[PDB]
Design an enzyme around this catalytic site. Structure first.
Site, PDB file in Angstrom:
ATOM      1  N   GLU C  44       0.822  -1.200   0.000  1.00 34.62           N
ATOM      2  CA  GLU C  44       0.000   0.000   0.000  1.00 34.62           C
ATOM      3  C   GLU C  44       0.860   1.256   0.000  1.00 34.62           C
ATOM      4  O   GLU C  44       1.792   1.395   0.794  1.00 34.62           O
ATOM      5  CB  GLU C  44      -0.924   0.015   1.216  1.00 34.62           C
ATOM      6  CG  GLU C  44      -1.696   1.303   1.385  1.00 34.62           C
ATOM      7  CD  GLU C  44      -2.157   1.516   2.810  1.00 34.62           C
ATOM      8  OE1 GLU C  44      -1.787   0.707   3.683  1.00 34.62           O
ATOM      9  OE2 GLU C  44      -2.881   2.500   3.059  1.00 34.62           O
ATOM     10  N   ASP C 109      11.743   6.200  14.448  1.00 37.15           N
ATOM     11  CA  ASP C 109      11.943   7.604  14.107  1.00 37.15           C
ATOM     12  C   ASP C 109      12.554   8.352  15.285  1.00 37.15           C
ATOM     13  O   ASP C 109      12.291   8.018  16.446  1.00 37.15           O
ATOM     14  CB  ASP C 109      10.636   8.248  13.629  1.00 37.15           C
ATOM     15  CG  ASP C 109       9.523   8.217  14.668  1.00 37.15           C
ATOM     16  OD1 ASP C 109       9.769   7.942  15.857  1.00 37.15           O
ATOM     17  OD2 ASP C 109       8.370   8.483  14.275  1.00 37.15           O
ATOM     18  N   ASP C 111      13.392  12.518  16.305  1.00 40.26           N
ATOM     19  CA  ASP C 111      13.036  13.867  15.888  1.00 40.26           C
ATOM     20  C   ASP C 111      13.570  14.885  16.894  1.00 40.26           C
ATOM     21  O   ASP C 111      13.798  14.581  18.070  1.00 40.26           O
ATOM     22  CB  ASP C 111      11.515  13.974  15.728  1.00 40.26           C
ATOM     23  CG  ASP C 111      11.068  15.296  15.121  1.00 40.26           C
ATOM     24  OD1 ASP C 111      10.290  15.259  14.144  1.00 40.26           O
ATOM     25  OD2 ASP C 111      11.472  16.369  15.616  1.00 40.26           O
TER      26      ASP C 111
END
Ligand code: ZN
Lengths: 217, 177, 389, 188
Positions: C44, C109, C111
């Protein structure tokens, strides 16, 4: 001493007389009913608990003298009795919980009896993968295993064996930083190992009991 | 310019002898007589409606294997127009692509798909239930009665007051009403 | 010279997507050698188009359709999701409940927004080289664990674009982990228990786990170069009040009297070390390490990695605000990474116009692209070796 | 269909017999059982995060229509003709809702679904055995029960206590579930 432990799988395909069918079920109910009473009246790690449970196991003939491998009379009795008694207790949810609870105390007791050397063979014959380590590697990572161990006081690292298992299978231990991890493997002592074994047996037994009630008609 | 109301109670249909026509029996109010009387209304020209389900790939019926040619609505349209309609003596029809759901006990049907909706007169012959083709896998609505079509299409929920616009007069009586 | 023009983006994006985007390497990565039947047709993709248009369930047959449908649409943002049991563009076909995610890479992740209490050099919207160490220190803190503690071999590190990094673990046995295992893995690597403004976020015991030991060992090599001389956490009263807020109550008076006699940040840090050791000797939470761990240890989010159907920014994308390309990071040179030298789409294009398709060999994007097939090449070695024999 | 064998004998004290008002329609509503929701070829129940289906949504309207009729009859000083009209309307909605399971288990029905019917029936016998366990735990005896009725021996001689005892069983069962509700039928 003997290999009386079994993860109850692969139902029997034999055929038996009606008298044996009734006797096995009655004996298994008696054994499981007395396990609960012993657990209530005592604690799981006393001499009285072990002695009385072992004497009762002797009396009901669920572990005794040998025979030719397959038609080992106590092993056969134990297997057929367990699978017979599943049908009786599959119906209700309160009965299911009771049967699951009492069938794990017996497995704990039987695992407490095994000699220190047959556990590896039992584990390998079990689901897929459990492995031990030699004294050389155990001493190589002794300090790291001790540091990774929980807040248990002191540096008492006895002679008990240490097993290496895939990290995923030890999930409940590694998410809290309570085991040593090295290249996708966890080094675990005996107590957490028997806890993992009991949890896996409970899951499989619950699945089988839930499936059995479906085909009861 | 003229519209008349009536309260229907019962309905009748004769598929074998008079296909595509239904009879509604009820009561109609009369101003001159200050009372209700019996009434019969004829409803004509109810069309058979069918739904064709296309395949994801063209299947050779002779062997039973795909040919790699993609299937579209137009392919089903031409196959029906040149193969099925002529075979089963169908002169005039109407075709349209529609989007429809399905959640019932027939295997290998998507729960949302594009179907070919074909409407034609009920006088024309009835296609077989299990009719299959090169471009369509299944057909729905073959043996649907006219009364059920009339009831579902117009949303009649039991007895109620119905308005008929542009009423017509029968040449000869068809009822004791 | 001229100001960077974000309105020119539609013009450059076209020739980027026609002549620069690595479609072949993309297909190789997301196909994984064609070992399984529909491992790519069931993937997807999410495209963020003009006017913040959000279309979620996309799918493609092979490479040609992939190029055709990114060249005919030119999305502003591209996200990669999980592989499902049915084609994502064909999910209304199946019954409600039979469409579910099955496999996905393990995504981490990191950040800049998680260090709001640590940066004293730039604001929330600014980054600078003297704080970017907080990102490289994280990279070697986490990459070690996944390489040593869990045994993950194929890891890809990508630049988020302005203020962070992403890690894609693409190993064969990692893509099929259950969500509970991913949550446990995130729990293992999580150290700062940052809640809704809690005073103390790091707690240690007498016995420290080897993971904690190695994390402290890695931070030590960059602690004084960043925290003590570049940030100056001990230069104003309000500045060291933040640190005193974590010390036990009985120590602040002695710390204040010892600090008032000091003349440099290094001497203040040494005095703090001596005072901490002296207080330790009498009474051990390891006071020397909590403030060191609290100020430098990376903070992760569980929600990103817990979800098996999460949508995350794709590699080789374009940031529509800054223009920076989400570029892979070379693991051999991590401490020398500079976010400000990453080429933009505008940089290469202007010089080029004044002069099966392989036009990217002469571009400035190429040296970073050679990192990608090196990641790609290592995957076939694992397939060729372990599987075939 | 589960049936509990009656406890044959003579009983001196008050006997409270209850009814399951739409036991099967309540299961369809409780566990979200529908044509467009159950994955089939005994099937497995759908996840609780899904929306309501077509069939469960039609049973809601049938019992949300009864409560308004039930409360509208509570008014006093009302026309004698509306009393019958509301009472008839209440019974009409009562009859329609109960016979909903019939379109699923009738072999000669147009909406027949064997896997769907088996799943509803299986949950039905679970609710029955669960209710029997609760009643015997509060020192009460179940002397019969068949899928739409339960007979309970109370060992009580005060009629005021029997209804108080009966309403306690009402809350006990209605605590675990939400939509299925028991109702008093009579006293022997
Ligand atoms: Zn900065």
């Amino acid at each position: 001493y003997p290999h009386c432990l079994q993860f109850y799988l692969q139902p029997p395909s034999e055929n038996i007389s009606l008298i044996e069918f009734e006797n096995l079920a009655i004996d298994r109910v008696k054994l499981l009913k007395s396990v609960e009473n012993l657990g209530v009246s005592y604690v799981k790690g006393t001499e009285q608990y072990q002695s009385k449970l072992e004497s009762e196991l002797r009396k009901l003939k669920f572990s005794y003298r040998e025979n030719l491998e397959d038609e080992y009379e106590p092993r056969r009795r134990d297997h057929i009795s367990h699978f017979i008694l599943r049908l009786a207790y599959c119906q209700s949810e309160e009965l299911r919980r009771w049967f699951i609870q009492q069938e794990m105390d017996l497995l704990r007791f039987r695992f407490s009896i095994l000699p220190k050397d047959k556990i590896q063979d039992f584990l390998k014959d079990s689901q897929l993968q459990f492995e031990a380590i030699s004294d050389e590697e155990k001493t190589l990572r002794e300090q790291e295993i001790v540091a990774s161990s929980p807040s248990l006081s002191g540096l008492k690292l006895g002679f008990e064996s240490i097993y290496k298992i895939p990290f995923a299978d030890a999930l409940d231990l590694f998410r809290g930083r309570k085991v040593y991890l090295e290249d996708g493997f966890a080094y675990v002592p005996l107590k957490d190992i028997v806890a993992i074994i009991l949890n896996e047996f409970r899951a499989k037994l619950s699945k089988a009991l839930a499936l059995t009630a479906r085909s009861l008609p | 310019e003229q519209v008349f109301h009536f309260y229907w109670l019962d309905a009748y249909e004769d598929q074998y002898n008079q296909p595509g026509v239904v009879f509604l029996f009820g009561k109609v109010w009369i101003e001159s007589a200050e009372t209700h009387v019996s009434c019969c209304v004829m409803v004509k020209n109810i069309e058979r409606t069918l739904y064709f389900l296309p395949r994801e790939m063209k299947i050779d019926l002779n062997t039973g294997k795909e040919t790699g040619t993609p299937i579209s609505m137009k392919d089903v349209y031409e196959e029906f127009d040149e193969k099925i309609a002529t075979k089963y003596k169908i002169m005039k029809f109407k075709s349209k692509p529609v989007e429809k759901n399905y959640a019932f006990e027939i295997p290998d049907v998507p729960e949302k798909s594009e179907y070919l909706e074909v409407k034609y007169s009920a006088e024309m012959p009835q296609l077989p239930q299990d009719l299959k083709g090169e471009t369509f896998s299944h057909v729905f609505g073959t043996n649907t009665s006219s009364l059920e079509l009339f009831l579902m299409n117009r949303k009649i929920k039991g007895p109620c007051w119905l308005e008929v616009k542009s009423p017509q007069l029968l040449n000869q009586p068809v009822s004791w009403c | 010279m001229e100001t960077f023009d974000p309105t020119e983006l539609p013009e450059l994006l076209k020739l980027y997507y026609r002549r620069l985007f690595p479609y072949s390497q993309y297909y190789r990565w997301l196909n994984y050698g064609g070992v399984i039947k529909n491992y790519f047709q069931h993937r997807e993709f999410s495209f963020t188009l003009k006017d913040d248009i959000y279309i979620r369930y996309q799918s493609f047959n092979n490479q040609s359709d992939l190029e055709k449908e990114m060249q005919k649409m030119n999305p502003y943002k591209i996200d990669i999701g999980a592989v499902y049991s049915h084609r994502p563009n064909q999910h209304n076909t199946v019954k409600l409940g039979a469409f579910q995610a099955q496999e996905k890479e393990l995504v981490f992740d990191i950040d800049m927004t998680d260090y709001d209490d640590v940066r004293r050099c730039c604001s929330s919207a600014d980054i600078c080289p003297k704080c970017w160490t907080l990102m490289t220190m994280a990279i070697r803190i986490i990459d070690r664990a996944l390489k040593e503690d869990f045994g993950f071999k194929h890891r890809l590190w990508v630049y988020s674009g302005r203020r962070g990094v992403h890690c894609w673990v693409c190993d064969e046995s990692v893509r099929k982990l259950s969500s509970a295992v991913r949550s446990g893995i995130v729990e293992y690597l999580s150290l700062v228990k940052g809640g809704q403004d809690v005073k103390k976020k790091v707690h240690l015991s007498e016995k420290i786990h080897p993971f904690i030991r190695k994390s402290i060992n890695i931070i030590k090599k960059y602690f004084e170069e960043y925290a003590l001389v570049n940030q100056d956490i001990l230069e104003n009263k309000e500045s060291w009040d933040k640190i005193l807020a974590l010390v036990p109550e009985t120590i602040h008076d002695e710390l204040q009297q010892s600090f008032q006699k000091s003349h440099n940040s290094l001497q203040r840090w040494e005095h703090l070390k001596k005072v901490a050791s002296r207080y330790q000797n009498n009474i051990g939470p390891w006071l020397e390490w909590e403030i060191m761990l609290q100020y430098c240890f990376p903070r992760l989010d569980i929600n990103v990695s817990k979800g098996i159907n999460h949508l995350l920014k794709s590699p080789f994308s374009v940031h529509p605000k800054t223009g920076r390309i989400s570029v892979p990071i070379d693991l051999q040179k991590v401490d020398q990474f500079d976010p400000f030298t990453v080429p933009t789409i505008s940089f290469i294009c202007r010089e080029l116009d004044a002069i099966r398709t392989r036009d990217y060999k002469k571009t400035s994007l190429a040296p970073y692209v050679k990192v990608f097939e090196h990641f790609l090449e290592n995957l076939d070695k694992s397939r060729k070796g372990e599987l075939l024999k | 269909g589960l049936v509990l064998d009656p406890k044959v004998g003579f009983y001196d004290k008050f006997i409270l017999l209850l009814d399951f008002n739409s036991l099967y329609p309540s299961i369809i509503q409780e566990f979200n059982i529908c044509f467009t929701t159950v994955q089939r070829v005994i099937p497995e129940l759908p996840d609780p995060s899904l929306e309501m289906g077509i069939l469960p949504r039609e049973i809601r309207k049938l019992v949300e229509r009864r409560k308004q009729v039930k409360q509208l009859m509570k008014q006093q000083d009302l026309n004698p003709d509306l009393i019958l009209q509301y009472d008839i309307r209440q019974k009409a909605l009562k009859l329609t809702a109960n016979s909903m399971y019939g379109c699923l288990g009738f072999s000669y029905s147009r909406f027949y679904a064997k896997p769907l019917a088996a799943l509803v029936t299986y949950k039905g016998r679970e609710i029955l055995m669960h209710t029997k366990e609760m009643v015997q735990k509060m020192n009460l005896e179940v002397i019969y029960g068949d899928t739409d009725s339960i007979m309970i021996n109370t060992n009580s001689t005060n009629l005021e206590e029997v209804f108080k005892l009966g309403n306690k069983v009402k809350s006990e069962v209605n605590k675990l579930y939400k939509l299925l509700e028991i109702d008093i039928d009579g006293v022997f």
